[PDB]
Amino acid sequence: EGVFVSNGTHWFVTQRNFYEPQIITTHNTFVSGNCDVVIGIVNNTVYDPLQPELDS
Amino acid sequence: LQIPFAMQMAYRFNGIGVTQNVLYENQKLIANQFNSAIGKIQDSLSSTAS
Numbered sequence: 001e002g003v004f005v006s007n008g009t010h011w012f013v014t015q016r017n018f019y020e021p022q023i024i025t026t027h028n029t030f031v032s033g034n035c036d037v038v039i040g041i042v043n044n045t046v047y048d049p050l051q052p053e054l055d056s
Numbered sequence: 057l058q059i060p061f062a063m064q065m066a067y068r069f070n071g072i073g074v075t076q077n078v079l080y081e082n083q084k085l086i087a088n089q090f091n092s093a094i095g096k097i098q099d100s101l102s103s104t105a106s
């Protein structure tokens with residue numbers, strides 16, 4: 001529920017009607033398929049909050 | 057406020073309860089179906105006044 005946006009170097013996800021940038025995570029987003037199908041895709045990290053909790 | 061037309065169409069899909077990836081994974085088919093349907097309006101309006 002949002003749009004991907006960049007300030008010039010970082011990538012964020014925002015609600016559409018008001019600028020409120022969030023870090024991109026596996027909860028702000030969902031998967032469908034491989035990179036090759038989509039016209040105009042971009043490359044970035046998607047953060048996973050479980051990985052530090054399993055590392056600790 | 058400007059927005060890319062394919063991203064605008066992904067939110068018009070999302071507004072009818074069809075998930076956004078259903079547009080981006082089918083974008084050439086959806087574009088060809090629209091372009092084809094506008095061609096049928098042009099032909100129908102040229103064909104009859106009724």
Ligand SMILES: *[C@@H]1O[C@H](CO)[C@@H](O)[C@H](O)[C@H]1NC(C)=O
Nearest residue numbers: 006007008009010011012021
């Ligand atoms: C973009 O966002 C990052 C993280 O808040 C910040 O460090 C950077 O200065 C911002 N501006 C540009 C132009 O990258």
Ligand SMILES: *[C@@H]1O[C@H](CO)[C@@H](O)[C@H](O)[C@H]1NC(C)=O
Nearest residue numbers: 035036040041042043044045
């Ligand atoms: C995105 O990342 C993959 C893996 O590193 C790479 O093969 C691909 O060329 C990259 N695409 C762009 C648009 O940079």
